[PDB]
Design a protein around this ligand. Structure first.
Ligand SMILES: N=C(N)c1cc(-c2ccccc2)c(CNC(=O)c2ccc3cc[nH]c3c2)s1
Ligand SMILES: N=C(N)c1cc(-c2ccccc2)c(CNC(=O)c2ccc3cc[nH]c3c2)s1
Ligand SMILES: [Cl-]
Ligand SMILES: [Cl-]
Ligand SMILES: [Mg+2]
Ligand SMILES: [Mg+2]
Lengths: 8, 229, 229, 8
């Protein structure tokens, strides 16, 4: 699953 | 608000305790109360607000995805009903965050660091609305996310270095918007690659600590490019 | 109750969906609604009730322990206030579960399997009350947990084989009660060892599937003995 | 941390 900033 | 009788400083202290306790709904309620005191938020305080609601909406989004998958496979009313219940609660959290940004965090943010932070958040919570949207407002939701992200990008390019972690996380999330919301995978790939390369060329200006901050987010851009290409 | 207008079968279906979505507060609310329909619960349904509230109270207990540790180190009112808030919410969940058991799950449980399950749960939720108790009711809370556990043990020894997983989990939790609530570590060690050894000598009677069920809980007894000796 | 039944 791709990363967004909130999940670092 | 139920937090109207508590001191601002006490709300911030309790938000930090709630974080340590992994009580993110409490953390969000405390930070909502702090915002509603009407004073601008510090960098640390902005981060506490972001972490709290990230975790709340993140659990709702993960639940929605599970339920939506089950609903798709099934295609009684129970699965749809329960997916709708979670969806409605998620939308309510997004509306609350957007309401804090509009009343009045963004208009009072008179520094690039604070204004970009809040405009990124506005894009993020319209994006979460877009993930579940289907009806006659989906296209307007997407455009609202795009507009917030774009204004944040414009400011960040003028006012922040390419390694600034808020700028990097903004570009990361705008690239995810392009890829999976706007159906613009080439825009997403182009943005992640240009952001990564311009940050790399700026690393030489950084301290050891800032270098760790920036390269952490660069790694997320790289991992996305690996997934998408 | 807010679940009074929903069909029993729909509440059970939604509790299972909530479990898959890791929405344990929702799961507990649905199972509370199912109980309040007034019919006895099946084995699967008892398990759904137990899992839901285990997860809800488990998050509260973990938060309480974090906050209590911070409070102890600190010894403003904020840490005490917030620990009290979590404590009060935890106590409310325990009171709700105990109320479901008393009105009227236990009195209507006319099978050893169901009655032992519920009496174990009664011991568990008085135990969670005892973990946070300090005032003039702590000793009575402890005795209420002990009494529920003991009645469950008496029934389970008469009516269930020593490898039955409800019996094993009962003995495990009663041993934990002895060790850390009642300050009876030798009772705790004796109970875990006798339970483990009597289950071992009964494994030869079991199918491959039952053997896996029983040895899973035996491993928890063994790991506790290793920690305590 | 010791085990109780619920955490298997
Ligand atoms: N309680 C929390 N969770 C936090 C408290 C503070 C804090 C504490 C004191 C002063 C200022 C801020 C945080 C600050 N992080 C940043 O500025 C930052 C740095 C690097 C990256 C990379 C991705 N995102 C980033 C954010 S996080
Ligand atoms: N949704 C869930 N989480 C569950 C649904 C059912 C279920 C489903 C269909 C019929 C009956 C029960 C569960 C049943 N587990 C037991 O009986 C059992 C067995 C072994 C051990 C060891 C420790 N505890 C145990 C419990 S768990
Ligand atoms: Cl529902
Ligand atoms: Cl509080
Ligand atoms: Mg004041
Ligand atoms: Mg009916």
């Amino acid at each position: 699953r791709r990363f967004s900033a909130g999940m670092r | 608000g139920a937090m109207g009788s508590m001191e601002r400083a006490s709300l911030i202290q309790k938000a930090k305790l709630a974080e340590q306790a992994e009580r993110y709904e409490d953390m969000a309620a405390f930070m909502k109360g702090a915002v509603e005191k009407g004073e601008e938020l510090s960098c640390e305080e902005r981060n506490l607000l972001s972490v709290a609601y990230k975790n709340v909406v993140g659990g709702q989004r993960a639940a929605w995805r599970v339920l939506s998958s089950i609903e798709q496979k099934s295609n009684g009313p129970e699965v749809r009903e329960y997916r709708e219940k979670v969806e409605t609660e998620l939308q309510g959290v997004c509306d609350t965050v957007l309401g804090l940004l509009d009343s009045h965090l963004i208009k009072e943010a008179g520094d690039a660091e604070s204004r970009v932070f809040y405009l990124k958040m506005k894009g993020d919570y319209y994006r979460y609305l877009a993930e579940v949207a289907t009806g006659d407002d989906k296209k307007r939701i997407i455009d609202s996310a795009r507009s917030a992200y774009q204004e944040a990008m414009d400011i960040s390019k003028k006012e922040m270095p390419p390694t600034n972690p808020i700028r990097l996380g903004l570009a990361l999330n705008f690239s995810v918007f392009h890829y999976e919301i706007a159906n613009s995978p080439e825009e997403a790939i182009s943005l992640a690659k240009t952001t990564f390369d311009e940050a790399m060329a700026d690393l030489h200006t950084l301290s050891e600590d800032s270098y760790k901050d920036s390269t952490l987010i660069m790694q997320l851009l790289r991992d996305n490019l690996t997934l998408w290409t």
